[PDB]
């Protein structure tokens, strides 16, 4: 049959400068726009996360057509003619050349939103002292928030169904996401997960994490998502929730009577990932 893996993942709190937009002047401005309630939020490009996943697949062995030199910062291709059958990166992320020269892309993901409105947070940079030139003064914008993004994979579209397994591990152990990690090291590893593994195209879990509370880090689950869960829609048997949000879910009153209690909920992330991979292998014959 056709199987789809939809999930919304929230990063961990910290300072991030991973989305420098245009560099208007000295200031390197975060990529930002109106998100909710008319408030400006900072967005991380989804292409950066795709690059991080490609780099993860490159690092942990595997076969990836685009090899990151990591010394000249130059991209090389092992085979000019893309072969989705062999290479993991071409099988997963697709390719456009400009065998078919075009691939659809098994992984479809959205840009990462900031769970907190971005108000100020500009930081000075001055280079050493004396003999100052035009490059001596510079500003770097930042943001103390939790980032959250939405992704979806159709394992049926993969040339090799077993390639779904490395992708989940890459999502968990994601390498650095493109940004100024030298001065703003932001770990992008998940701390709360909401995964849905179903056989139909409806997701309804696009951005389940929402807390508002301006400059806090509470990171509660959105009311509308909980209402949808109680509605009977989104079967709890097809839901996978794991991370720090699990504690808040358990602390909720009447949680046992709520349908959320019947969903696959694990406080530990790795055990939830193991259960999800077991279910995926059982339903994919691997």
């Amino acid at each position: 049959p056709n199987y789809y893996l939809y999930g919304t993942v929230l990063t961990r709190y910290g300072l991030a400068s991973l989305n420098h937009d245009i560099r208007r002047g000295n200031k390197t401005i975060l990529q930002k726009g109106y998100w909710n309630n008319g408030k400006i939020h900072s967005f991380v490009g989804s292409s950066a996360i795709r690059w991080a996943l490609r780099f993860y697949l490159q690092k942990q062995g595997y076969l990836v057509n685009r090899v990151w030199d990591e010394e000249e910062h130059i991209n090389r291709l092992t085979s000019e003619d893309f072969d989705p059958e062999k290479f993991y990166d071409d099988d997963i992320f697709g390719f456009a050349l400009l065998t078919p020269n075009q691939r659809m892309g098994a992984l479809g993901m959205n840009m990462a939103v900031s769970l907190t409105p971005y108000d100020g947070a500009v930081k000075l940079g001055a280079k050493s002292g004396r003999e100052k030139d035009s490059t001596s003064l510079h500003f770097t914008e930042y943001h103390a928030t939790r980032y959250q993004y939405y992704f979806g994979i159709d394992a049926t579209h993969l040339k090799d169904f077993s390639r779904i397994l490395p992708m989940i591990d890459g999502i968990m152990n994601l390498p650095k996401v493109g940004g100024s990690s030298n001065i703003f090291n932001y770990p992008f590893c998940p701390d709360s997960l909401v995964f849905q593994w179903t056989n139909h195209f409806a997701s309804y879990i696009s951005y389940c994490f929402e807390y508002c509370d301006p400059k806090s880090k509470e990171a509660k689950l959105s009311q509308e998502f909980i209402d949808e869960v109680e509605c009977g829609q989104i079967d709890p048997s097809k839901l996978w929730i794991g991370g720090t949000i699990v504690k808040d879910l358990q602390q909720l009153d009447n949680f046992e009577s709520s349908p959320l209690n019947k969903a696959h909920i694990y406080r530990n992330r790795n055990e939830m990932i193991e259960a999800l991979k077991t279910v995926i292998k059982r339903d994919l014959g691997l």
Binding site: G25, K27, D119, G120, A121, V122, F139
Partner: peptide, 9 residues
């Protein structure tokens, strides 16, 4: 003038 981070600033 270019350097500013909203309201109070």
């Amino acid at each position: 003038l270019n350097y500013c981070y909203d309201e109070l600033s």
